[PDB]
Symmetry: C2
Subunit: 205 residues, 2 copies
C-alpha cells in the first residue's frame, strides 16, 4: 500500500502543519510542499484542503470518542459533575481537534463533495451515538438530551479554544490591560463549570 | 458628515452583502464594488474586511444587548427557564450576528490593529456586563456564572447557526438521508433546552 501510507503521510503533514501555525490558514500547496510531492499528485488523494481537514476532523472524533468512552466506562453511573469534568478535560486537552470542531460546519459547507459530507456526518454521528450511550447509562438521559450535551460540549470547546488563541500579540494585549481580563479565556475551567451545571440542570429534571 | 454617512453606508453594504450570501466569503473588493467607490478610498475608512466585520459585530452586540435587556428588564426575577427562553429567542432571531459571533475570534486574531481589537473587546465586554447585571438581578448569580452563561449562549448560538447553514445542497442532503436526521439543526429549540437546563443547574446551587 504505497497508497494507504501515502494518504496517512499526507494527513500527518496536514496535522503537524496545523500544530505548528494553526488551521485557519493552511493551504493545499503548503501541505504538498511539506510532503514533498507536486500539487497535482496530492489532488489525486484529496480534492481540496477542506476534504483533508474533514478527514482529520473525523479521525479526531474517533480518537476523542474512544478516549472519552474508555474513561466514562469506568465511572459511577450517577455523578453529573464528574461526567462534565471528563468531557472538559478530554476536550481541553485537544486544541487541534477543537479548532477543527469549530471550523467543520464551514469546511463541508460547499467545497467538499456531497458523498464526502455524507460519510463524514455518518462517521461523526456514530461517535455521538457511542458517547450518547454512556450518558444514558451513567445519567439516564434520553437521546435528545444526550445530543444536546455532546453538541454543547463540542461547540463550546471549539469556541473557547478560538477565544483562547487570538494571535500572539493579542494574547499579550489581553494580559496587559486590566479591562480585558474577561477576554482571557481558560478553556477547561469554563468548560467544566458549564457542562457540570448543564448536566445537573438536566439530572434535576 | 459625508464621513459619518460614508462609514454608515459602507457598513450597510457589508451587512446586506452578508445577508445575501453569508459572511465567510465576502471580500473587501465586493463591498467596495457594492458601495460604488474605489478600493483605495474604502481603505481610508477600513484597513481590512476583518475590521469592517469587527465593527458590524460590535454594532450587533449593542443591538442584541439592548434587545435582550429591554426584555429581561420586564421579567420576574427568579425563573431560569424563562430567562433561558429570552436568550434563545433573541439569538435565534439574529443569524448574521450569530455568524459574526462565531467568526469574531478568528477576525481579530491577526489582520486587525491592536487598538481596534482593544476597542472592540472593551465595547463587547460592556454589553456582557450590562447583560450580566440582569442575570444577577433576576437569578442572583455571581460575575463568573453570568459570564459563563453569556459566553455559552453566544458561542453556542454561533455554532448552531453554522451547523444549520451548511450550504443549499448539503441542507437538502441532510433532509434526504434518514441517517443524517441529527445533522439537521434547529437553533432556537436546542439553544432553549440547553440554556434553560444550564441556568437551572446553576440556580439549584
Amino acid at each position: 500500500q504505497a497508497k494507504q501510507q501515502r494518504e496517512e503521510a499526507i494527513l500527518d503533514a496536514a496535522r503537524e502543519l496545523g500544530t505548528e501555525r494553526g488551521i485557519r490558514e493552511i493551504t493545499l500547496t503548503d501541505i504538498a510542499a511539506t510532503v514533498g510531492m507536486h500539487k497535482s499528485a496530492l489532488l489525486r488523494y484529496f480534492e481540496t484542503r477542506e476534504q483533508i481537514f474533514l478527514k482529520i476532523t473525523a479521525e479526531g472524533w474517533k480518537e476523542w470518542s474512544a478516549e472519552l468512552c474508555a474513561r466514562l466506562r469506568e465511572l459511577p453511573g450517577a455523578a453529573p459533575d464528574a461526567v462534565g469534568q471528563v468531557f472538559a478535560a478530554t476536550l481541553a486537552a485537544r486544541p487541534l481537534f477543537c479548532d477543527l470542531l469549530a471550523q467543520a460546519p464551514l469546511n463541508l459547507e460547499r467545497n467538499v463533495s456531497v458523498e464526502s459530507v455524507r460519510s463524514f456526518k455518518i462517521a461523526t454521528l456514530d461517535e455521538v451515538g457511542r458517547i450518547g450511550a454512556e450518558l444514558r447509562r451513567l445519567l439516564g438521559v434520553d437521546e435528545t438530551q444526550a445530543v444536546d450535551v455532546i453538541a454543547t460540549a463540542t461547540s463550546l470547546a471549539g469556541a473557547l479554544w478560538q477565544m483562547a488563541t487570538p494571535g500572539p500579540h493579542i494574547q499579550t494585549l489581553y494580559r496587559s490591560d486590566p479591562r480585558l481580563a474577561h477576554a482571557v479565556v481558560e478553556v477547561e475551567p469554563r468548560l467544566n463549570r458549564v457542562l457540570g451545571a448543564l448536566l445537573r440542570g438536566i439530572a434535576d429534571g
